[PDB]
Design a protein around this nucleic acid. Sequence first.
DNA 1: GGAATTCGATCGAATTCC
DNA 2: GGAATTCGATCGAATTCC
Length: 124
Amino acid sequence: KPGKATGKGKPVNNKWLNNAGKDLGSPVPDRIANKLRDKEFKSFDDFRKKFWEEVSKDPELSKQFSRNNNDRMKVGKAPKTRTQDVSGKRTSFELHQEKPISVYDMDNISVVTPKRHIDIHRGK
DNA sequence: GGAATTCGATCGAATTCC
DNA sequence: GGAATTCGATCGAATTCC
Ligand SMILES: [Zn+2]
């Protein structure tokens, strides 16, 4: 299931993931989208790692993540969410993909907290 | 009937292979 | 180093015991 990353993303501030626990979550930063756009991906896992890797490279974004979180993103692992936003063993930020019942649209990909992601996939 | 386990949709992430 | 395979997690409806 290889494809091309497409999308304009969206402008984010220094409170990027604050609303990552409500609705569909935080959007894909335009800066990040410009770095992934047009690139191929062999799977969503690939896209996920490359995504967090990019975030660790954006100065304005990394400053929002503790040293430990930045270390994880530097190798492709997702940053750890607040302790109250986890769900059992799932304690890392997750990427939600919006798409019809019937492909890497960065305008349909968002960052959510395990807690919030579980509700979404059960109606809320 | 009701408890126990299965399993498919959604995920992160490690292991395995050339 | 990159890509495919395998491992786990969560949830709960559907399905399998007993
Ligand atoms: Zn989702």
